[PDB]
Design a protein around this ligand. Structure first.
Ligand code: FMN
Ligand code: FMN
Ligand code: CL
Ligand code: CL
Lengths: 122, 122
């Protein structure tokens, strides 16, 4: 599900954005490119310190969107690219998906996104 | 209302994320930090090439969220910061707000976000 160009983006620095659906509109939070941990089976794991509103949204609607990119990875028509990822999210406080990001001692949980599609948008 | 630290983030490269309310959940698109033009009266202007789905969403619900950041600008508790911006959006196709981004020869419109709040989230 995740292409090589996505893994090239993860070798570079940047701001990741994660959109969820809430009762009165979308919500949008961040992490860093370097914090994402990709697992077998199309999973992207994010260390969670805050994400309280995000977690409440995900408990009611698991579908999330994530974007990320880098000036330093070539896109289709010149330098710079990024991705729109769609997937289903879950929060974990134990098990191997939590252990994947437990090195971040500030992490109360892991946000685990099981990818359904990845689109290179540039 | 946009603070100095936000303009510091704009001196740096990065991926900007813009969330809108879609018919069946959020939508999320991107631009680059360096593409944003800030005008007086709390306005952030983005060059629009695609964004047809985003534009349809804004016509139904003008409220948008935007995030952006940089590893190179100090946050409250170490290196790296970013912002959550909430505002209302409109799409201009002539006049000073369009001229503000017309340097992008591929632009079909200017996305004008009038900022209601800016929160440094790191
Ligand atoms: C560049 C950047 C990176 C961030 N990294 C994280 C992160 O890895 N994990 C986290 O929980 N919050 C991180 N934050 C803060 C979140 O974006 C968010 O503001 C916070 O978790 C509160 O989430 P909520 O609004 O869903 O309650 C980061 C913020 C920025 C601007
Ligand atoms: C890093 C990055 C920068 C982008 N810059 C722009 C931009 O400045 N303007 C634009 O219209 N689309 C830009 N795109 C593409 C949009 O994110 C989006 O995929 C496209 O405009 C289609 O919008 P829509 O899904 O609302 O129809 C960029 C994509 C990436 C990954
Ligand atoms: Cl990073
Ligand atoms: Cl940039």
């Amino acid at each position: 599900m995740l292409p090589g160009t996505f893994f090239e983006v993860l070798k570079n620095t940047g701001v990741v954005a994660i959109a969820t659906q809430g009762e009165d509109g979308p919500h949008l939070v961040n992490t860093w490119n370097s914090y994402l941990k990709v697992l077998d089976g199309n999973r992207i794991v994010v260390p969670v310190g805050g994400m309280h509103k995000t977690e409440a949204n995900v408990a009611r609607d698991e579908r999330v969107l994530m974007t990320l990119g880098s000036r330093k990875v070539a896109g289709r028509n010149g330098p710079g690219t990024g991705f729109l990822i769609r997937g289903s999210a879950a929060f974990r406080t134990d098990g191997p998906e939590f252990e994947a990001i437990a090195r971040f001692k500030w992490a109360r949980a892991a946000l685990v996104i099981t990818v359904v599609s990845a689109e290179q948008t540039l």
